[PDB]
Amino acid sequence: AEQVAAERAARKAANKEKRAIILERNAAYQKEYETAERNIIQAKRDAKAAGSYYVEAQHKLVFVVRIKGINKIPPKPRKVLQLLRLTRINSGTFVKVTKATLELLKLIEPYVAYGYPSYSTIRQLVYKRGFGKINKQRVPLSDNAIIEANLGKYGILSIDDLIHEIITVGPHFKQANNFLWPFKLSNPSGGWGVPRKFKHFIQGGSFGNREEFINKLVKSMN
């Protein structure tokens, strides 16, 4: 009457095959990325070849980090940074940028710094600081079993499937991003690169949009 090793040697194969089914989409993702971006650069150089301009497809995803202190904040900017999980300094999260998503970032603009993150930025950001909301319980994401368990409802089971599901703002972006925790970042390593940080970036300050520059900033807040 053993009954013991019957049910536990099934998970070795279960895991090796779910790892083999993770692998396939991860390699497919590297393929996806380089084909899409090399096609973008090639369309730019093709429109330049035959005399015209290929206009960049305006961005569909942006990363946002809040800065100003807990205190001395008007009621509605306070409300909205409470409304985007941004209740701390150097905390940050992503936004699906529709243009309804968009007009709240332009209400918090002097309290945040945001823009368009590279793949590598997002990957380094969710590897080191990616956390999941589980009965709120702020779990750290040590391996893919947990996004399998929470989001086996979306065909999303790899950490890089999740990366892909936001860097492409996938059809179930929101059910994934809300699951993600806000990102407790530190203060930037090489300072803030600007002496007084509460002026607009355009004004030699540090708040506003910095489109491809938050990369350099957020990689520094590792």
Q: Which residue from 10, 19, 21, 39 is in contact with RNA, where contact means CB under 7 A?
A: 19
The answer to whether residue 87 forms part of the interface with RNA (CB under 7 A) is no
The answer to whether residue 106 forms part of the interface with RNA (CB under 7 A) is no
The whole-angstrom separation of Cα 63 and Cα 80 is 16
Comparing CB distances to RNA, the nearer of 51 and 74 is 74
The answer to whether residue 215 forms part of the interface with RNA (CB under 7 A) is yes
Q: Which residue from 69, 152, 193, 195 is in contact with Mg ion, where contact means CB under 5 A?
A: 195
At its nearest, how many Å lie between Mg ion and the CB of residue 47? 28
- Bridge partner list, 208: 113
Comparing CB distances to other proteins, the nearer of 164 and 206 is 164
Q: Which residue from 62, 113, 160, 162 is in contact with RNA, where contact means CB under 7 A?
A: 160
**Residue number with the smallest Cβ distance to Mg ion:** 195
The answer to whether residue 84 forms part of the interface with RNA (CB under 7 A) is yes
The answer to whether residue 178 forms part of the interface with RNA (CB under 7 A) is yes
At its nearest, how many Å lie between RNA and the CB of residue 58? 16
At its nearest, how many Å lie between Mg ion and the CB of residue 166? 23
Task: Please list, residue by residue across 3-27, b when 16 or more beta carbons sit within 10 angstroms of its beta carbon and e when fewer do.
Answer: eeeeeeeeeeeeeeebeeebeebee
At residue 170, the 3 state secondary structure works out as coil
Residue among 119, 141, 143 nearest 130 (CA): 141
The whole-angstrom separation of Cα 40 and Cα 42 is 5
Comparing CB distances to other proteins, the nearer of 131 and 194 is 131
Residue 195 binds what, of other proteins, Mg ion, RNA, none (CB under 5 to 8 Å, by partner type)? Mg ion
State the CB neighbour count (10 A cutoff) for residue 160: 19
Strand 208-209 with 112-115, pairing: parallel
- Bridge partner list, 92: 65, 183
The whole-angstrom separation of Cα 184 and Cα 187 is 10
The answer to whether residue 100 forms part of the interface with RNA (CB under 7 A) is yes
**φ/ψ of residue 78, rounded to 5:** -55, -45
Residue among 71, 64, 82, 89 nearest 186 (CA): 89
Judged by the rule CB under 7 A, the positions of this chain that interact with RNA are: 8, 11-12, 15-16, 19, 26, 30, 76, 83-85, 96, 98, 100-101, 118-121, 123-124, 133, 136, 142-143, 145, 160, 173-174, 177-178, 215-216, 219
Binding site for Mg ion (CB under 5 A): 195
